[PDB]
Amino acid sequence: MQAIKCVVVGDGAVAKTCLLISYTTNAFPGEYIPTVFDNYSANVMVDGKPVNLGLWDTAGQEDYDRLRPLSYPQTDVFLICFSLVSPASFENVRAKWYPEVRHHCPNTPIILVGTKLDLRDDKDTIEKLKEKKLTPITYPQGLAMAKEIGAVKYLECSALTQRGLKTVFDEAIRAVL
Template identity: 35%
Template sequence: MATSAVPSDNLPTYKLVVVGDGGVGKSALTIQFFQKIFVPDYDPTIEDSYLKHTEIDAQWVILDVLDTAGQEEFSAMREQYMRTGDGFLIVFSVTDKASFEHVDRFHQLILRVKDRESFPMVLVANKVDLLHLRKIPSDQGKEMASKHSIAYIETSAKDPAMNVDKAFHELVRVIRQQIPERSLKKKRKTKWRADRSTVSHRLHCVVL
């Protein structure tokens, strides 16, 4: 809940990238975060970008979130977007063992693209509402996160949503610890890439 008027200028911008296998609920999480609705149907994403002013820990910020394709044929495009991201949500589904096994691959890819030994990331275990279909227990997810020294959050995009806002906010907190605010302000007007012709849609959300 906002406690003050939105500053008009000079807000830090956080460019967040949501990655993971296709069908793990990346788009559902992102749309739930921005629009507070649950989209149950799976429609493979090429790339969707979302923009939002929000208040996190008493500081107003701009969140520029990119929901990426999970399909392997879009891997080259995904790497291009990774180069400009400030932080990453690595999403897997607790009902899909393969998506969990691919967490290592996404983690390694981010570090390779960034040419860093560490980078702001949060591991997101999604679809925890599907208790009867769950294959990845909490302990296993936490162990994976611990192995990579990143935060771990369990989420559900289905109404009533669970920890969706928390996942995005936690990533911002991790970025704040590792990236100077002045660098974030400089990137406010930069785009994910110059040509957005492959974007399926762009959603500009109101201040919440």
């Protein structure tokens, strides 16, 4: 048997925790149950052989920054997550999350994923962002960032419709493969 270790990081304004718990629960969209505990581990494979998948639930709070650097060593892969409709998430990634995670483990394949793909094309959300002088991050910016970081494959997933989330996890599992 083999196990997969992956570190998922992000800000609290995007709430990747809901997406992760919905994926682990495999429940129907819109009917997820938030749970008290973090660190949702599960035994789900896609191809090759059954393996154990680990998802370290990292808090977006700045106070727990001293607890994160020790989780990076001896980890198979890392998942940097941002939102295409949240410019604040993009700024946070470009400022703190991308540089520090890259610095901690320079030699590891990286996968970049986009959160809230559904709200990227939403007219009301775009109107509200433009009113709040916010610009939804589109595909070219994510592609440019992925080419800058040399990611294996840039991805875009969603939570309300789960669009590509299973493909995202398949790519994450097969990155080592």
